[PDB]
């Protein structure tokens, strides 16, 4: 597989290997807010990562992954539409060529500069690789970005992107907390869907937050020198990872917010 964002291998292609591309359950979906209902029945959201261990930054062609220890229950996600306990196991990003475009989830249709996914995959099912094989396998707490004021808790994060600019290189990355990439506010819209890159598994259960982070514009610029390459490779420049707007189908997105 060789899939990319691409005119000739993006997101219009990918259905060729992925026939689950034209699926039930796809994400990322727009979010029409006048539409989205807000849902009495969901639980307060949880987001526990005081013990959270990071290891390792890792460029994967596709974006750039935080990876995190998720060999015991260190930092997880509860609560809110999700039963039982979900660990976190990485986070990346998605990103434009422009401020105006590179989240995936869009809101009333507007994009944002930028989206944040922490992946949690479902302990009950004893590993990830078992997880993302099961309906309710994985919980991906989803951030926009929007370009204003720096993050200060995104820059240990900018500051190692020099390090890893290319496909397959990675870089040791203890000791990171990824309560510093967190909004004020946990209001959410909640929906079943999928992963947003191949293999396009329809195994998520998605809380995107209301509120965005900010960050500047010096921040996002440099995750536009990234590259798709590998080393000594043409530069491809690692911008507009992001798949668009997929049919919401039989599905409602619920709001935690009155
Ligand atoms: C086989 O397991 C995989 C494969 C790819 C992704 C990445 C991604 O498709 N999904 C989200 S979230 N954004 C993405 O880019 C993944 O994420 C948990 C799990
Ligand atoms: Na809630
Ligand atoms: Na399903
Ligand atoms: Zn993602």
């Known amino acids: 597989h060789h899939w990319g964002y691409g005119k000739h291998n993006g997101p219009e292609h990918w259905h060729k290997d992925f026939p689950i591309a034209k699926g ?11 539409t989205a209902k807000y849902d009495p029945s969901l639980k307060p959201l949880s987001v526990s990562y005081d ?3 990071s290891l390792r930054i890792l460029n ?6 935080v990876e995190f220890d998720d060999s015991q229950d260190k930092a997880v996600l509860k609560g809110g539409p999700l039963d039982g306990t979900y660990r976190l196991i990485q986070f990346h990003f998605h990103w434009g060529s422009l401020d105006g475009q590179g989240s995936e989830h869009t809101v009333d249709k507007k994009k944002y500069a ?17 997880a993302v094989q099961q309906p309710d396998g994985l919980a991906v707490l989803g951030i926009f970005l929007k370009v204003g004021s720096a993050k200060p808790g995104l820059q240990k994060v900018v500051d ?8 397959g290189k990675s870089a040791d990355f203890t000791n990171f907390d990824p309560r510093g990439l967190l909004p004020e506010s946990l209001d959410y819209w909640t929906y079943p869907g999928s992963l947003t890159t191949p293999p396009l598994l329809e ?6 937050l209301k509120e965005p ?3 500047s514009s010096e921040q996002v610029l440099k995750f536009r020198k990234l590259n798709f390459n590998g080393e000594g490779e043409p530069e491809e420049l690692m911008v507009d990872n992001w798949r668009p707007a997929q049919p919401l189908k039989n599905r409602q997105i619920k709001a935690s917010f009155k």
Do not use: M
Request: net charge negative.
């Open 60 to 65: 994967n062609g596709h974006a750039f992954n």
């Open 203 to 208: 195994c998520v259960t998605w809380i995107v």
């Open 160 to 167: 190692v992107l020099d390090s890893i600019k290319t496909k």
């Open 51 to 53: 013990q959270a261990t």
């Open 24 to 34: 039930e359950r796809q994400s990322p979906v727009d979010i029409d807010t006048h």
């Open 213 to 215: 982070i900010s960050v």
């Open 114 to 130: 930028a989206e944040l996914h922490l992946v949690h995959w479902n302990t009950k099912y004893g590993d990830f690789g078992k």
